[PDB]
With several copies, the nearest count.
Chain A
Amino acid sequence: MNGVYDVGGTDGLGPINRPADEPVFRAEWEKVAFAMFPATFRAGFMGLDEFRFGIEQMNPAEYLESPYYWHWIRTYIHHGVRTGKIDLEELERRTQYYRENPDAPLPEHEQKPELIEFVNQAVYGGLPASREVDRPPKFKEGDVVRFSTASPKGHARRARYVRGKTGTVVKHHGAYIYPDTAGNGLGECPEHLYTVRFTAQELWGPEGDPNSSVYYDCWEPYIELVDT
């Protein structure tokens, strides 16, 4: 979609705040929001591409200034409602309870070994997105290609600053899960993935470093040939 999260090329966002050191997790709630990602993933809330689209639908001012892991909370709730796994009135009534009883205990529960095994498996074996396809890559290194001008309203990885731009295919990576379907609940429908090189001048006009380039990854449908 065309949301504020797509910040590449934006001006006026402010200088970088970079403390000399910061902990991994700044508060207990951050650990919780973090662990909730494998938990809702295993449970069918969403996958990786759908997770991202949930954040992409946040209120823009909250996205820009809220703590990062709060975005994850937003996306969990988003897909909890979407899938019926989360009832909102129950959630709002309980928030009120923990506002007024911040030290009340959490629900009684059994520990589950399979959730730890799940955790360990994912962390160390990864969740690979590459896939085999019956079609051969349409493009190759050195091909000149132009980036699609389409502006779909669902999830995609089509940064506005590359749309309609021209570049050179750098590497073909194999085929991977396609965000434009995956992120919209339409399945993996894997496509070939390529890195494409865009000069800063192509990207920014005269304001572009004549000696700088941006490398951007494009799924096959994003790019049509210019020169081979």
Chain B
Amino acid sequence: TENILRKSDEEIQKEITARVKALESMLIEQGILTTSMIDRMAEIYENEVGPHLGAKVVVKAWTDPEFKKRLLADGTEACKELGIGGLQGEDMMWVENTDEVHHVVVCTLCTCYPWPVLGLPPNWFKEPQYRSRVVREPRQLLKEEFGFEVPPSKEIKVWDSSSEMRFVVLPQRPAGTDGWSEEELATLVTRESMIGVEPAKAV
């Protein structure tokens, strides 16, 4: 929103850049930070860990009812079967969208998010507009921001991740996909679908 007090976005970046480089230079001389270690972190979360990992679990649960059971009884363990897990998904609890119930996930106190299956959160998930309103007016926010209409008669459960437990929505499998291969179903599985802010893609 407009703030007559706020410098330009360009002047902000220039300051932040100098401050980070000065901080960087100090931890480099302490021996605790290196260029290779920055690059590795960036490669992993730019290219390696992302919502393609979650889509794989989802399409497995959609096609393997017994795995779906295991995913719902204990999420970390189930995802481990597919070789998926680790940092910020050490405890993972998947919640299944039904015809009776819609799930949506938020972190109102900070920015908690299940990295091993969704990668790093998009900026909108970390920001106060989403975090402040989804616990208070989930139904309106989902239509208004995501054009997602939850019929008034369907329960919406908002999961505020205040602990190291990470909640992930199992979105409902779109109709029209009966007999689809795991690869074809995956294309319907979105980051947004496992946050609860959208369904999986129609068609």
**A: which residues have CB within 8 A of B?**
2, 5-11, 13-18, 22, 24-25, 27-29, 31-36, 38-40, 42-43, 48, 52, 55, 59, 61-62, 64-68, 70, 73, 76-77, 85-86, 90-91, 94-99, 102, 106-107, 109-112, 115-116, 119-120, 122-130, 151, 157, 159, 161, 171, 173, 176-177, 193, 195, 197, 203-204, 209, 211-219
Residues of chain B lying within 8 A (CB to CB) of residue A195: 165
- Whether A8 contacts B132 by the Cβ 8 Å rule is yes
Given A24-B45, A216-B160, A8 and B108 contact (CB-CB distance below 8 Å)? yes
Given A126-B90, A195-B165, A27 and B13 contact (CB-CB distance below 8 Å)? yes
Query: Shortest Cβ distance from B132 into chain A, in angstroms?
Result: 4
Report how far A76 CA is from B159 CA in the complex, Å. 29
Scoring B residues 88 to 116 as 1 if CB is less than 8 Å from chain A, else 0, what string do you get? 11110100000000000010111100001
- Whether A91 contacts B26 by the Cβ 8 Å rule is yes
Residues of chain B lying within 8 A (CB to CB) of residue A176: 91, 163-164
Report how far A117 CA is from B132 CA in the complex, Å. 38
Report how far A102 CA is from B23 CA in the complex, Å. 13
Report how far A6 CA is from B91 CA in the complex, Å. 23
Total B residues in contact with A, Cβ cutoff 8 Å: 89
Instruction: Specify the chain B residue showing the minimal Cβ separation from A157.
Output: B162
Scoring B residues 124 to 159 as 1 if CB is less than 8 Å from chain A, else 0, what string do you get? 101111111101111100000100000011111111
Cβ contact of A40, chosen from B4, B20, B32, cutoff 8 A: B32
- Whether B159 contacts A215 by the Cβ 8 Å rule is yes
Residues of chain B lying within 8 A (CB to CB) of residue A211: 152-156
Residues of chain A lying within 8 A (CB to CB) of residue B163: 157, 173, 176, 193, 217, 219
Given A8-B108, A17-B124, A115-B37, A212 and B25 contact (CB-CB distance below 8 Å)? no
